[PDB]
């Protein structure tokens, strides 16, 4: 084990593939809060402001590192972990 020193935008709304954010909270993890995205629609909003079913909103997922308390509840000992986080959505052509 190693010693570690522990020391916006409205795109989610104006996007043609808009998303909602959700507070993923885990007291056994550093960071305890991770904001994850879920696309609002199946389609994408077109130039006329309507949902176009010919296009699809898809989440963009990113692998990130987090610290997991080990043993549980420990304030000063963790294990490194990799998790997949949905950050936002993009519109894709099929």
């Amino acid at each position, epitope marked *: 084990t190693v010693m570690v020193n522990l020391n916006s935008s409205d795109y989610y709304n104006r996007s043609t593939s808009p998303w*909602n954010l*959700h*507070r*993923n*909270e*885990d*007291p*056994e*993890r550093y960071p305890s809060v991770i904001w*994850e*995205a*879920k*696309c609002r629609h*199946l389609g994408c909003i077109n130039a006329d402001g309507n949902v176009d*079913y010919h296009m*699809n909103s*898809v*989440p963009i*997922q990113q692998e990130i590192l987090v610290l997991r308390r080990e043993p549980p509840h420990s304030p000063n000992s963790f294990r490194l972990e990799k998790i997949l986080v*949905s950050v936002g959505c993009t519109c894709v052509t*099929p």
Partner: antibody
Amino acid sequence: EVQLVQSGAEVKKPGESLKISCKGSGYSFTSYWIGWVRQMPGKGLEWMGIIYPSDSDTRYSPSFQGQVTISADKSISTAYLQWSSLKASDTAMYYCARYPNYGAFDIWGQGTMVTVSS
Amino acid sequence: EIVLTQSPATLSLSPGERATLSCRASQSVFSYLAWYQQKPGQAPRLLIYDASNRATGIPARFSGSGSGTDFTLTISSLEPEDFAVYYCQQYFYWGWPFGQGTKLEIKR
């Protein structure tokens, strides 16, 4: 052990209200969604709706919107499924299941059988 | 608006035989697809997630493949405990998560 434990079998009369529970343990209840699934005797799995216990965001299947209410009490890691007025047609097994965002239902409750009869 | 349709409705095979189960989505679900096994009076059990990843403890005879609209679950050589209902499930957009199920019964 990561699990979801559901409340016991229910026998209710038509017109009565019912709230069934699903308690998670061994994991962060505020890091995953919970889905509710109905299974009528000898039939397939039907999605009823979901909840993200961290913020109580809920979505329902069009067949269940306005018929049931899904809720959660994150202080006791519990999700709920409730009917205001039961009907005989609500006689079915009800499962709760965990799933991470854009992930499969990986942990399942044991099911709650609900029988509705006069 | 996504619907999954499974084929066949009932697959009749003998122990030792290779089983091929199909799942077609009404539009792409990318790789946000899972397969479950369900025995009578029991909860569904996750077999495959992300179209092709075997869940922990699931035997190697089970394999999943596909992407977009067409998916397959293959059981290389049927064991007696493999006769059950199988469901495919999408978690891209709801829509409807579950396929209607394929009953894998013993042939005669």
